[PDB]
Amino acid sequence: SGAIYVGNYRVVNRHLATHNDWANLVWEDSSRDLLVSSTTAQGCDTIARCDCQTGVYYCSSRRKHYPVSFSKPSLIFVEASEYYPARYQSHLMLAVGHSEPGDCGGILRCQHGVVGIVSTGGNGLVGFADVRDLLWLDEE
Numbered sequence: 001s002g003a004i005y006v007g008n009y010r011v012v013n014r015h016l017a018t019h020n021d022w023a024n025l026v027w028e029d030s031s032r033d034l035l036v037s038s039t040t041a042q043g044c045d046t047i048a049r050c051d052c053q054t055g056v057y058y059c060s061s062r063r064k065h066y067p068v069s070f071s072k073p074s075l076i077f078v079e080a081s082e083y084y085p086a087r088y089q090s091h092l093m094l095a096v097g098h099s100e101p102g103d104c105g106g107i108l109r110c111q112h113g114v115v116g117i118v119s120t121g122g123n124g125l126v127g128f129a130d131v132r133d134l135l136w137l138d139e140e
């Protein structure tokens, strides 16, 4: 589990979104496994605005933050998980590392802020849903 709290936005994995998220929906995209809902309280996370390919992610199933290199956001074929069938997922970045279903929502961060959240795992790879292209998170 986990979210990003920027401005009056909460960014979560679409497959973990709550009723309250859908009841306060701003934007969602199944192909990216993302959903954004509106918040009453201001959040304090900063979204990275960059093309970094190195950063650190939180892996809840190891209670550890791991430094990783990660790929550029792309359309990646992902094997079946407990929460999606095998499919293409868009705006996804891969690293070599551990990720199990409960790790979804863990933050990937670089020097500029939050890059994205864990979304995929298996075959010794971790996949992160990029948020750096969602420039509207910075405003309004």
Ligand SMILES: [Zn+2]
Pocket: 048, 049, 050, 051, 052, 110, 111, 112, 113
């Ligand atoms: Zn960066």
